[PDB]
Each structure stands twice: as C-alpha cells, then as structure tokens.
Amino acid sequence: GADGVGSSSGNWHCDSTWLGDRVITTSTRTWALPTYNNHLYKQISNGTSGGSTNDNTYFGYSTPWGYFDFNRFHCHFSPRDWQRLINNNWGFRPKRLNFKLFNIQVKEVTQNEGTKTIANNLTSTIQVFTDSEYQLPYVLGSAHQGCLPPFPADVFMIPQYGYLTLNNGSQAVGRSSFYCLEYFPSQMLRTGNNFEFSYQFEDVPFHSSYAHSQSLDRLMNPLIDQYLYYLSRTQSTGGTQGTQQLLFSQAGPANMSAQAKNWLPGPCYRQQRVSTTLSQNNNSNFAWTGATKYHLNGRDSLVNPGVAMATHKDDEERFFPSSGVLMFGKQGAGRDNVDYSSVMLTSEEEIKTTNPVATEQYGVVADNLQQTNTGPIVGNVNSQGALPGMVWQNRDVYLQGPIWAKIPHTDGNFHPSPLMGGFGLKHPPPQILIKNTPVPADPPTTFSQAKLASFITQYSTGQVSVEIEWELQKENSKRWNPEIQYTSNYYKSTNVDFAVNTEGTYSEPRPIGTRYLTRNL
Amino acid sequence: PLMGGFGLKHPPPQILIKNTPVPADPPTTFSQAKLASFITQYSTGQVSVEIEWELQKENSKRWNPEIQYTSNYYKSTNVDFAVNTEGTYSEPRPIGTRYLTRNL
C-alpha cells in the first residue's frame, strides 16, 4: 500500500471535457454519513386501521445503510455546460461512468453533560459495496431527494436506505422478501483506502433533443392536390330538397383536413385541465376527487406525470393538466400546501406536433349505425391505446430531472421509456451502499447472551467523485433562418441567476428544457 | 503597467488555497438542507518561491564616480531596515532602482 494517513488518497477533479463527439463530465462533493437506526433493521408499516386509507398502506424495512444518489442531471452539468449541450446538439447518450471515494475520514463524538467534542477515530472503518447483480430493490429513479448538490460548495448528507415489499393492509403476505444488506461481499475502507469502480452503459438510444418543425398533419405539399378521393357530401347539393346522393371530391389545399395521411398521433390518456387563472377553475376541491387514476390491486394510484403529451393548445398558456406536467420547487419551498408562486411548472409545448393535447379528447368515433330513420352519433375517445402507424415523441429531460431508470425485469414491456424521462436501462448503474462499521461501547465484565446495545456515536466524511462519459450526436442542419437558443436575461437583475445570493444561497430560478434545436419530423 | 513592473500577457498564474470543510455531526434523521454546522479549522505551513532573474550587465566609460545607494554614516538611535526594541521591522524609506547613469 504505502499510503497511510500521511497522504491524500484522491485529488479533486470537477473538470468537464468536450472532445469530438464524446463529452466527459466529472464532479466531486463532500459527504457526511450519519449513523442510521442505531444500527438496527426495522420493520416499518402504515396501516389502514389508522387514519390512512387503503392507498397509503405499505410494508417494508428501513436499513441502517445509506446510498449515493447521483441520478439527476444537475449533478453532472454546470448550467453553462448544460447550455453547450442543449444548444449545439441533437442528441446525447451516456457511454461509461467511473466512481471514486477518497480522503475518507472518520469521527466520533462524545458528550459530557452539555459539552460537545468531536475527535477522530483512526481505527474505525466503513463498508462499501456496489450491488452489481441487481439483487436488491433498486431504489434509484423514483425521484427521491438527496442527490449530489448542484453547486460544488455544498456539503451533503447521505440519505438513508430502505425498501418496500408486498403488503396486505399493514401486514405482510407470504412472498414478502427480506434482504439483509450485510450479507453481501463488501469491501471495507479505512482512512488510507480509496474505492473505485467502472461501469459501461449498454447501448441505449440517443435521447431526442429537437422540436419538430412540422406538425404531424401538415406533412403534405401545399401546392399539389392528391389523387385519392374522400366522401365530401351525402346530401343533394344546391337544391331545395336534401335527397341523399353520394358525392366525392379530391382533397387539395382548399380543404386539407380531409387529405389522407400515413400516420397517427401518439397514444393519449386524458388528464383533468386546471387553469392558472384562479377565476376560471371551479370553486371546490376536485384535486384528488376528479383526478386521473389507475386502479391496481384495489389500491388507487394517481397518474403522475402520465405519458408524454402536449400540455396545452395554442393561444392558451394558462391551462395545464392536473397531474400531467412535472412540477419542481423553487429554492426554499415548503413541503406541505406550498403556494403556487413557490413551484415551477414545466411545459411540454414542443411536442404539440406529434403528440396530442394532454387535456383534450384524442379523437371522435361513431357510436351508432345509421339508418334513414336514425341519424349517426359520435362519441369522444378519451383513452386511445397504441395502434399501428402511431408516432410519438418522448418527454425531454430537464436539468433538474433524473438521468435514468431501471426497466423492471418483467416479460412484457411496450417501448420501455420511463415516464419521468431519461434513459431506461435493463442493467442500470449499480447503486452503492455505505455504512459506518458499528463500534460497541464497553461490554460488561460478566458475559451475557444479548447483543451489545451500547454503541459509540460516530459519523464519517469524505470526497466522492464521478465521471460520466457521454456521446453527443452532432447536429447538421440546413435551415436558413436562425434557430431558437437558450439565453440568459439581458436586462439588469437584483442578483445573478443560477448563482449565489447575498446569504450564500444557490438558487436555480427556472427549469431548463433540452429541446431547442429544430429538425424535420 | 502604470504602477511599474513588467506587464505580462500571461502572468505568473495565481494560486488559490482553502481548507476542506469538515462538517460537524449531521442529524440522525435525514433532511434535505446542506450541513450548516462545521468544525472550526485552520491550517499552516511553509511556502517557498524562487524567481530566476537575468541581469543586464553594465559597461560604461564614464570617468568620474557614479551615484550609489548608501546607508547613513551618521549614528542613529536604531538601525534602518532592521528591527527595533519592540521587535518591529521598519523600512524607513523607499528605494528607487535608478542610480547608474547612461547616455540618452
């Protein structure tokens, strides 16, 4: 080894490099791993016998271990480096990543009455194992808090680990699995050690970063008619009587709606439409009641976000689907009943081309069968499954949103793109679990059967580094006039955006979409 | 540069240094906010710098003596450019760089 506490195991690399198509972006932060659950696995459950309803019942365990979550973009891209990505490129996908712990140091805190003193414990060691066979519940991708902070000057606290399993009410059915974490081979790192591992993403499709320049129904040619015919009129034209006759015509630029087309909009699953204008919405609480839910195993679940769908039609920015759009918070936003002004509502408007309005009917079909005595009748289709000849475009990843998700290992899936966005992976980056090694206090002089319940209060810190080597899909486009670009406000402001304020508080003002450059549908 | 000294299009690169912040006890229950409690700390050490200079040697045929920078010959209460009774190093006067003479 020849290392010891005399040296620093690792150096600080926060550098990002743009090389040809590749772009290699690394980071580092400072983490403090608190002791969890006094080192006790615990069964946790929430029953429907309490005030909880049948939807909120869960069962599972909360482990002492804790896990690193880097899954979000803003970890790995500075708001400038995310500008060079969305402005200059069509698509990007990862290739490989690399991960390092270093400069690990441990501390143990004592209490004499009020006094509080904090010393180093050289002997104590921490346990790190990457779960590479996916043999645990993979809990990343559910958009939990605790990701590496955006702004490198922040020190973050590693979030606790724990999982859920099959429940029936509060109780547990027979198949409930219990995973004891200490049961996996886990390298132990002392202060002189570093930890490192490499991972190489599977081939995964380039995420689409462009807004189509042509709505799906305008793919026609404006000059020339079409050779096909449609049924224009069933009634006698230009007469005092409407006696029925079948008339046909050709579908030209005069009426473009009737022109035959080779494709269909993406699938549609309706959402209730809520207006930011307060006077327009109904006066009531319809939030949960009139929400769009799916019913599984007798447990209702609100559909958040829902499939990628255009947020609103043109000349209305105020309407948004109830649970449809991703919703972030502003810096320092309360957890409960936060006012509207403290949250940010992303907008899908770039997909209005190929995907339907979220809040409106997908289409209209005939309910009945006509007769001389009985006129035709047509109803709305709210939820339209996928049909052949349907093209849809995936939701764009945001700076704040997650990078990936694990496609569940099940027999059947249809175009497995995670709803929140980001690359679905059949073998995601393996999560990492880390814990202090519990160091017991004085055992008694006389042996006794029970396990030692008195532990030495302890927590450790260190520097963690991650690179993610990305592939950029370069952009070649002949469009004459200028594009749209993501640009900072030119007008004077009280404090700079995406940068600290007087208190030292880093505040990201607004979400940053990935779609700006344009392409032909 | 107006203050004098060599203007450089790529000067000596400045050096930035900071302690690595070491956080105090985080709470038992996880919480979103960054850790606001740090362990008061400061570091010390020895820094060394050399600067290798080139001197332009002086060749001059002037007959009579030059002017030279010389310390005061008369007795003084304490030595200039050196500590005083309190241990206080005091530079008494500024020292120009121009003494030797040359033909315009």
UniProtKB/TrEMBL annotation, chain A:
Family: Belongs to the parvoviridae capsid protein family.
Subcellular location: Virion
Major location category of this protein: virion
GO CC annotations on file: T=1 icosahedral viral capsid
Sequence ranges assigned to domain Coat protein VP1/VP2 Parvovirus in this UniProt record: 1-493
Organism whose genome encodes this protein: Adeno-associated virus
Name of the protein this chain belongs to: Capsid protein VP1
This protein's record includes keyword Cytoplasm: no
GO molecular function: structural molecule activity
Keywords: Capsid protein, T=1 icosahedral capsid protein, Virion
Signal peptide: none
Lineage summary: Viruses, Monodnaviria, Shotokuvirae, Cossaviricota, Quintoviricetes
